[PDB]
Amino acid sequence: SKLPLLTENGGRVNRVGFTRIAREGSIHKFGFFYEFTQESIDFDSDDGLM
Amino acid sequence: SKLPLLTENGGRVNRVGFTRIAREGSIHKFGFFYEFTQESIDFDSDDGLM
């Protein structure tokens, strides 16, 4: 049924159109830490604990 | 029953004929178009849409 058709001199018969779409992304942040004391590292029985 | 059998003295006994047929085909025309404006081409965010 929907087949484009024209004659020898053709004007204003079949029109088309176009469309575009968009996407997204985002960023987050993370972290953690730990704490110690000097007496712990100095008087520990194990060297190289750090 | 329908074998072509000849005889010692025979003429005008077994005639045959032939036939031919014809085929045909035709061509058609297709086409379509699209339109735009100067405002769309100039003020569109993305260049090279065309």
UniProtKB/Swiss-Prot annotation, chains A, B:
Localization of this protein: Virion
General function of this protein: Assembles, to form an icosahedral capsid with a T=9 symmetry, about 60 nm in diameter, and consisting of 535 capsid proteins.
Listed name of the protein: Major capsid protein
Organism: Enterobacteria phage N4 (Bacteriophage N4)
Organism lineage string: Viruses, Duplodnaviria, Heunggongvirae, Uroviricota, Caudoviricetes
Residue numbers of the full-length protein present here: 102 to 151 of 401
